[PDB]
Design a protein around this nucleic acid. Structure first.
Ligand SMILES: [Zn+2]
Lengths: 69, 63, 203, 101, 142, 140, 141
RNA sequence: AUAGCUGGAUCAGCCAUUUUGGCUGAUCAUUAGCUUCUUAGAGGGACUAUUGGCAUAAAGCCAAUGGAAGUUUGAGGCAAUAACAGGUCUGUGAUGCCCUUAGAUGUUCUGGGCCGCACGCGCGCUACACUGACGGAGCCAACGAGUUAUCCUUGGCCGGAAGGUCUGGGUAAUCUUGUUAAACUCCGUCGUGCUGGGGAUAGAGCAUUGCAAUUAUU
C-alpha cells in the first residue's frame, strides 16, 4: 500500500530529494517512495516552473526531466 | 582455454530423425588442421563461424 | 540555409553527422564479442527501426534485418498486441533513451553486447524414436543464437512487467543493461546457463 | 439547342462495340460535332451461394458474377437523321434509350 | 508572412483558439452543462469542464479546412467506437443535438454562415480571426 | 518552362505530385513536411531529403497530394512521390551524369523509395475467415 | 499547489454506510450503494467542491451540503431524465434511489412481483433468468 | 460538363501589395480544350532472356544485374477414371412403389413452438488490465446496395439521436457517397489492489420496425 496523508513530510522530502536522481517519472518515484499516483504528477508539475528540473521531451504517459547540469 | 572458435565451409547434409539438426565439417583458426564433424542444431551456411567447448567429441551421426 | 517550410536544423545536423540514429551515434559501434559477426547489421544505419520490407522471402534473408527491428518484431508478442508496431517502436525508443541516460555508452552497443552474452553456445536436441528418449549435446548457429537471445530477452521483459508499476520500456531497458554485463540478475542469462548445464549433463 | 443523348448499355462486348462503331461512323459520315464514344465504369454484381442442395457436406461456397457495361453518346443530329440511325441500329441484346430534355 | 493554419500544430491551435473564444465568452452553453456525453459512443463524463470552448474552436477550424459541414457529418467525424457490451465493438455516430447546439452557438457568435448547396460555410470574420490567430501563434516566440 | 509530374503508391494508397521551379515552399497537403499526422513516422518521410541535402531542393517548388491507404501507406506514398518527382525533375533539366549519381546514391540508401513495392493481400478463400486460417475440426 | 498541512479525520458514517477517508472522492462515493460513475461526477459538480482534494479534507458544511443535494436531487436543478427511478410504482414520482432504502427495495420488488404471482415471479422464486435467454448450454452451476 | 486539371465572365479574407501576387476557393453547363489521376475496347511486356555455375557439360538445376514479373508470374475456375450401398423422395407439378382420402396423412383461422432444463459435446465472442479504461481534440481506405406504386437518404427546425416534422436529391460512377471508419496520434485522470479491467446477472421508463415485442424485437 501507498500512504496519502499530507503530513508535511512528503513535500519537504521530495523537494530535498529531487537532486538525488535525474530521471523523474511515475515509474521511478513509486520505487523511491510510497506515492499513490496523484502527487506523483502533481509534484512534478508544481516543480516544473522551478529551475531545478529541465524538460526534455514530454508525453501523455510520462515526461522526461533532467537535473541542472 | 576451453573456448576455441572454428570455421565451417561445407555441409554433409541434413541429418537427424526429425531433420532439424545439421552435421557440418568444422575447421579451427589457430590450427588449420584437426577437422572435426559436429552436430549443429541451427541452420549453417557456407563460411560460417562456430563456437565449441568440448573440442574432443568427434561425433559421427545422431540416431 | 532554409526555405519557407520550417525545416529544423536538427535534421540538417543529423545528415551532417553521417546520419546517426534518432539520438545516438552510429559511427563507433561494432560487435565486440567474437563468434557473432556477419549476422547483425550494426553498420546499417536507419533513422527508424521500422522497415516494411521482405525479411522472410529467402532462406537467410533474416540475417540482414536490423537488430533493433528484429527486437521490435520479437516484442510483437502477446497477440493482444500482435500488429501494434507503433507501440513497440515507442517502447524501444523509450528504453534506448533510458539506457543512454543511465550509462553514457551507446545503447546499441549495450544491446549488441546483451544479445551476444545471452546467445547460447551449447544446446541439447532430442533423439526421439522412443527408446531411452535421451538428449545429446549440440552446438548452435549464430543466427539461432540471436534468435534465442531475442526471444529470451522479450519473454523475460514480459514476465517482469506483466504485473508491476514499472513500465515495459523501463523493464526492457533494465533487462538489456543487466544482460550486457555479468551480474547474474538477468532471466535470459539464467536460461542461458540452464540450457548450457543441462546440455553438459546429458552430454 | 437539340442535343440527343443515347444509351449504349449491354453485356456483350462485341455487339455493344459494333453498335457504338456504327453510330460513330454515321456521326463521322455527317458532321455533328463528331463526338466520340464515352465509357462508364463497369457495374459488376457479385453474389455468393452454396452448392449442396442439402446441408450435408463440406463448406463450399460458389460466387457468381454479373457485370454490365454502359456507354453514352451525345449527338447534334436532326430528328429525321436520329430516327433513321435508330432504325438502322436495331441489334439483338442491345438496349438503347434517347433523352430529349 | 502569409501564414495560415495549415502550418500550425493541431492541438496547440485548438487550445489557443479555445482560449481566444473564452475571451469573448458569449457561447451561452445550454442546460446540460456537464451531463451530456456528446452521443452514444461515449460512456462517461469529461474531465475537462471547458470542453465546449474547445469544441467550438475545433468546429471553426474544421469549417476553415473543409468546404461545408453538416450535423450528420459532424456526428460521423466526432463519433467513435462503441463498447456494445460483450459483443465486438462497432461504430456509431454521435448525438446531433449537441452538434447542432454548438453550430447555432457559433453562428450566434459570428464565425459560421449558412450557404447554398446545403450545409454552411466559414464567415469572413472567421477567416480573418483564423489568419490573425495563426500569425499570433507564429509570433508568440518573441 | 521547367516542370514534371509523377506519383507514388504502396498498395491501396496513392500520392500524385506536381514539380515546379521555385525557391522552396515544399509542403505535404497544405501542411509542410515538418508537420504531419503522425510523430514517430516523420523520419520515413525525411529519408530521401537528407541523403541529397536541401541545397539541391532550394531550386524546386513541389506540393504533393495524398489520398488513400493507411498511415504507413500514406507516408510511404508521399515520400515515394516526392523522391520520384525530384529525380524526374533532375532527369529532364540537369546533366545525365548528375542524375546517375543522384539515382545511384538514392539506390544505395533506398528504403524502397524509388522502386515500386508489389505488396498485395491474397484473396480470402472459403472455409474460413482468413485466406489460410481455417476453423478447427472437432476430429471426433 | 495546495496546502499540505491540512485536516484529516479518517472515515465517517454516512447513510448507514462508510465513506473512505484517504481515497479519491470518485472512488469513495462508489462505495455508497446506488451510486455509479457519472452520477457521482454530476452530483459533486453540482455540489461545487474542489475535485483535486480527496474525501479526507472535507468539512462538516461541505459534507452536509453534498448529502442534502443528493437527498433532494431534482430540487437542485438536477435533470430528471438521468434519474434511475422515474414515475415510481408506489410514490408515483421520480424518487431517487439510495443505499439504505435499496437494502429493502430489492425484497420489496420481489414481494411485489411474487404476491401478484407472475411468470416472472415463479422464475424469481425458482432462481432462473427472467429474460428470454438460453440455458441449454449456458446458465449452468 | 453524369469525374478531375487549366484559362476565363465570378467575388471574399491580410503580412507583402499599386509591376509586389503566395493561398483556400466560392459558381463551373456561363464557356473553351486535355485526360497525369477515373473508365474500358485493343494491346505491349518475361520466355527463368543475359552472362556466373551443376547435372551423363541432352532433357533439366542454382545464384545475380536489368526489369514488374519469376513459385507453371501469383491466387482461383472447369477438371479424366472408378469407388462411398454418403446426403438430399422437407428445394424440385422430377418420380416408381406401400398406405390414406370425407370423421381426409386435403385446404384453412386462433392459442401454445421449434428459443421449454439439476447436465455431457462442439463452433465463435468477452476481459483477466497501464500494451488497458475514461475524457477531449488532428485525421487516414476498399469491395458492395437502393424507390412503380412505396426503398437509400440530404436541409431548417424542434428532442430523452430513441423517434417524429415539412418541403426534398435519387430508376442511379449525376442523391445517400468523397459511406471525413476503426486502428493511431497531442494532452489530463484512473496507479496498481478480483478497483474507474471485465458488465455474467436483477429493476424502473423512451422510441421506430411489425393484427402486436409476455417467453423483456432492437
Ligand atoms: Zn426452393
Amino acid at each position: 500500500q501507498h500512504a496519502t496523508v499530507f503530513d508535511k513530510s512528503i513535500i519537504d522530502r521530495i523537494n530535498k530529494e529531487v537532486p538525488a536522481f535525474k530521471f523523474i517519472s511515475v515509474s521511478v518515484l513509486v520505487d523511491r517512495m510510497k506515492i499513490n499516483g496523484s502527487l506523483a504528477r502533481i509534484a512534478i508539475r508544481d516543480l516544473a516552473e522551478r529551475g531545478v528540473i529541465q524538460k526534455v521531451d514530454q508525453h501523455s504517459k510520462q515526461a522526461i526531466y533532467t537535473r541542472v547540469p | 582455454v576451453p573456448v576455441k572458435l572454428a570455421k565451417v565451409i561445407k555441409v554433409l547434409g541434413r541429418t537427424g530423425s526429425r531433420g532439424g539438426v545439421t552435421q557440418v565439417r568444422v575447421e579451427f583458426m589457430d590450427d588449420t588442421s584437426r577437422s572435426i564433424i559436429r552436430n549443429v542444431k541451427g541452420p549453417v551456411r557456407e563460411d560460417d563461424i562456430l563456437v565449441l567447448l568440448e573440442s574432443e567429441r568427434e561425433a559421427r551421426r545422431l540416431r | 540555409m532554409a526555405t519557407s517550410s520550417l525545416t529544423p536544423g536538427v535534421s540538417l545536423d543529423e545528415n551532417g553527422s553521417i546520419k546517426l540514429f534518432n539520438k545516438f551515434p552510429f559511427e563507433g559501434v561494432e560487435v565486440k564479442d567474437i563468434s557473432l559477426v556477419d549476422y547483425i547489421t550494426i553498420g546499417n544505419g536507419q533513422p527508424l527501426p521500422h522497415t516494411a520490407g521482405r525479411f522472410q522471402t529467402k532462406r537467410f534473408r533474416k540475417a540482414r534485418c536490423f537488430i533493433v527491428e528484429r527486437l521490435t518484431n520479437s516484442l510483437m508478442m502477446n497477440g493482444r498486441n500482435n500488429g501494434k508496431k507503433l507501440l513497440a517502436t515507442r517502447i524501444v525508443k523509450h528504453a534506448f533513451e533510458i539506457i543512454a541516460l543511465l550509462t553514457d555508452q551507446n545503447p546499441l552497443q549495450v544491446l549488441v553486447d546483451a544479445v551476444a552474452a545471452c546467445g547460447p553456445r551449447e544446446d541439447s536436441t532430442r533423439i526421439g524414436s522412443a527408446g531411452t528418449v535421451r538428449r545429446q549435446a549440440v552446438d548452435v548457429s549464430p543466427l539461432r543464437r540471436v534468435n534465442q537471445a531475442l526471444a529470451l530477452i522479450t519473454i523475460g521483459a514480459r514476465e517482469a512487467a506483466f504485473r508491476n508499476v514499472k513500465s515495459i520500456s523501463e523493464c526492457l531497458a533494465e533487462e538489456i543493461i543487466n544482460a550486457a554485463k555479468g551480474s547474474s540478475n538477468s532471466y535470459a542469462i539464467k536460461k542461458k546457463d540452464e540450457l548450457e548445464r543441462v546440455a553438459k549433463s546429458n552430454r | 439547342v437539340h442535343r440527343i443523348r443515347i444509351t449504349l448499355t449491354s453485356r456483350n462486348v462485341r455487339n455493344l462495340e459494333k453498335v457504338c462503331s456504327d453510330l460513330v461512323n454515321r456521326a463521322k459520315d455527317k458532321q455533328l460535332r463528331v463526338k466520340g464514344p464515352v465509357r462508364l465504369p463497369t457495374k459488376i454484381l457479385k453474389i455468393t451461394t452454396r452448392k449442396t442442395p442439402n446441408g450435408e457436406g463440406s463448406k463450399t461456397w460458389e460466387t457468381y458474377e454479373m457485370r454490365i457495361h454502359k456507354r453514352l453518346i451525345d449527338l447534334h443530329s436532326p430528328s429525321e437523321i436520329v430516327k433513321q440511325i435508330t432504325s438502322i441500329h436495331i441489334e439483338p441484346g442491345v438496349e438503347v434509350e434517347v433523352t430529349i430534355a | 508572412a502569409g501564414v495560415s493554419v495549415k502550418d500550425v500544430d493541431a492541438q496547440k491551435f485548438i487550445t489557443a483558439y479555445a482560449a481566444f473564444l473564452k475571451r469573448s465568452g458569449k457561447m451561452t452553453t445550454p442546460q446540460w452543462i456537464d451531463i451530456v456525453k456528446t452521443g452514444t459512443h461515449k460512456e462517461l463524463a469529461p474531465y475537462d469542464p471547458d470542453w465546449y470552448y474547445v469544441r467550438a474552436a475545433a468546429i471553426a477550424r474544421h469549417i476553415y479546412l473543409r468546404k461545408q459541414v453538416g450535423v450528420g457529418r459532424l456526428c460521423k467525424v466526432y463519433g467513435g467506437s462503441v463498447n456494445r457490451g460483450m459483443r465486438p465493438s462497432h461504430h456509431r455516430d454521435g448525438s446531433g443535438s449537441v452538434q447542432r447546439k454548438v453550430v447555432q452557438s457559433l453562428e450566434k457568435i459570428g464565425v459560421l454562415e449558412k450557404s447554398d448547396n446545403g450545409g454552411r460555410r466559414i464567415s469572413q470574420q472567421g477567416q480573418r480571426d483564423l489568419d490573425r490567430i495563426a500569425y499570433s501563434l507564429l509570433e508568440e516566440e518573441s | 518552362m521547367q516542370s514534371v509530374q509523377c506519383f507514388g503508391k504502396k498498395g491501396n494508397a496513392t500520392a500524385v505530385a506536381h514539380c515546379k521551379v521555385g525557391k522552396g515552399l515544399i509542403k505535404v497537403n497544405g501542411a509542410p513536411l515538418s508537420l504531419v499526422q503522425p510523430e514517430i513516422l516523420r523520419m520515413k518521410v525525411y529519408e530521401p531529403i537528407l541523403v541529397a541535402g536541401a541545397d539541391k531542393f532550394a531550386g524546386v517548388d513541389i506540393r504533393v497530394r495524398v489520398s488513400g491507404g493507411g498511415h504507413v501507406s500514406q507516408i510511404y506514398a508521399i515520400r515515394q512521390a516526392i523522391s520520384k518527382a525530384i529525380v524526374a525533375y533532375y532527369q529532364k533539366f540537369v546533366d545525365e551524369h548528375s542524375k546517375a549519381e543522384l539515382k545511384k546514391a538514392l539506390i544505395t540508401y533506398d528504403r524502397t523509395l524509388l522502386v515500386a513495392d508489389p505488396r498485395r493481400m491474397e484473396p480470402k478463400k472459403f472455409g474460413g475467415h482468413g485466406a489460410r486460417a481455417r476453423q478447427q475440426k472437432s476430429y471426433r | 499547489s495546495l496546502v499540505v498541512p491540512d485536516n484529516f479525520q479518517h472515515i465517517l458514517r454516512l447513510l448507514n454506510t462508510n465513506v473512505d477517508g484517504k481515497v479519491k472522492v470518485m472512488f469513495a462515493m462508489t462505495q455508497i450503494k446506488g451510486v455509479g460513475r457519472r452520477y457521482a461526477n454530476i452530483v459533486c459538480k453540482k455540489a461545487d467542491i474542489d475535485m483535486s482534494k480527496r474525501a479526507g479534507e472535507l468539512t462538516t458544511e461541505e459534507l452536509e451540503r453534498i448529502v442534502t443535494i443528493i437527498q433532494n436531487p431534482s430540487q437542485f436543478k438536477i435533470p430528471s431524465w438521468f434519474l434511475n427511478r422515474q414515475k415510481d410504482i408506489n410514490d408515483g414520482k421520480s424518487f431517487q434511489l439510495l443505499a439504505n432504502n435499496v437494502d429493502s427495495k430489492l425484497r420489496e420488488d420481489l414481494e411485489r412481483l411474487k404476491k401478484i404471482q407472475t411468470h416472472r415471479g415463479l422464475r424469481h422464486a425458482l432462481d432462473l433468468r427472467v429474460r428470454g435467454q438460453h440455458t441449454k448450454t449456458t446458465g449452468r452451476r
